[PDB]
Design a protein around this ligand. Structure first.
Ligand SMILES: *[B]([O])([O])[C]([C][C]([C])[C])[N]C(=O)[C][N]C(=O)C1=[C]C(Cl)=[C][C]=C1Cl
Ligand SMILES: [Cl-]
Length: 262
């Protein structure tokens, strides 16, 4: 059966023409509210969180790792390189690459993080090490965004991603300095104003990471601090039937508004 929350989410899904996945964790009582919570969705750029977190984990035993310069060559540039293009024939540190990937969704920066982990499988291995049995990263940017219906590549479920995002930011999957750094990065994201943030009260602090891809795939994952109550974690994934469907960040904002009502 379904609650009124899930009925509202289903009606939003129906009106939108696509497939919506939602997972909310309320850390006050560890309850979850799910909509298609165990179905797989293409993560697209929301996978940048796991890649950055994996490098943070590496830095727990190599304290200066984040400050290590990494060469940016002309040939490294892919389809969206707002920060990395400023450093061609130059360098960016792993911290700078992490900030660029998370806060600007720079795809060259993401590919450097993936390479630092030994390839997409290294990101997946980190996920398994922190108890995420669902996440899989198969490809680099930009092909991880093909988002073909039914394809398990580069997917996770809303429930799994919400649980992991909680572990990474409010829990202790990462060390102290590292989890605080991840929170700082997520809070300063520049690309999320029309997504989850647009559906929540303005007094709430939010850290988030968006993503987008083919099939009009439009995603956001967030850690949320309401004023005067325990924080929440929210995942909103959305994908559509036709390859060239338009982005629908408004659907994510609407899903967040629905979840926040209660
Ligand atoms: B992320 O969602 O992975 C990222 C964020 C944007 C802001 C750069 N998305 C993409 O790169 C989307 N890319 C595609 O849909 C794409 C691009 C290219 Cl060049 C080739 C294949 C695909 Cl699927
Ligand atoms: Cl994005």
């Amino acid at each position: 059966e379904t609650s009124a929350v899930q009925q509202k989410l289903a009606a939003l899904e129906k009106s939108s023409g696509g497939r919506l996945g939602v997972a909310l964790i309320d850390t006050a009582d560890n309850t979850q509210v799910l909509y298609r919570g165990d179905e797989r969705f293409p993560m697209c750029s929301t996978s940048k969180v796991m890649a950055a977190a994996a490098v943070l984990k590496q830095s727990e035993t190599q304290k200066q790792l984040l400050n290590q310069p990494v060469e940016i060559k002309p040939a490294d540039l892919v389809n969206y390189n707002p920060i990395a293009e400023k450093h061609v024939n130059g360098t960016m540190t792993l911290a700078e690459l992490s900030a660029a990937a998370l806060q600007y969704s720079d795809n060259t920066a993401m590919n450097k993080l993936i390479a630092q982990l030994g390839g997409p499988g290294g990101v997946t291995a980190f996920a398994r090490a922190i108890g995420d049995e669902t996440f899989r990263l198969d490809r680099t940017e930009p092909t991880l965004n093909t988002a073909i219906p039914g394809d398990p590549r580069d997917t996770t479920t809303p429930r799994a991603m919400a649980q992991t995002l909680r572990q990474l930011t409010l829990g202790h999957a990462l060390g102290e300095t590292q989890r605080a750094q991840l929170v700082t990065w997520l809070k300063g994201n520049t690309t999320g104003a029309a997504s989850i943030r647009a559906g929540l009260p303005t007094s709430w602090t939010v850290g988030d990471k968006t993503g987008s891809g083919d099939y009009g795939t439009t995603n956001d994952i967030a850690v949320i601090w309401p004023q005067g109550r325990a924080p929440l974690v929210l995942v909103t994934y959305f994908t559509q039937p036709q390859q060239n469907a338009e982005s629908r960040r408004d659907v994510l904002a609407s899903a967040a508004r629905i979840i926040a009502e209660g």
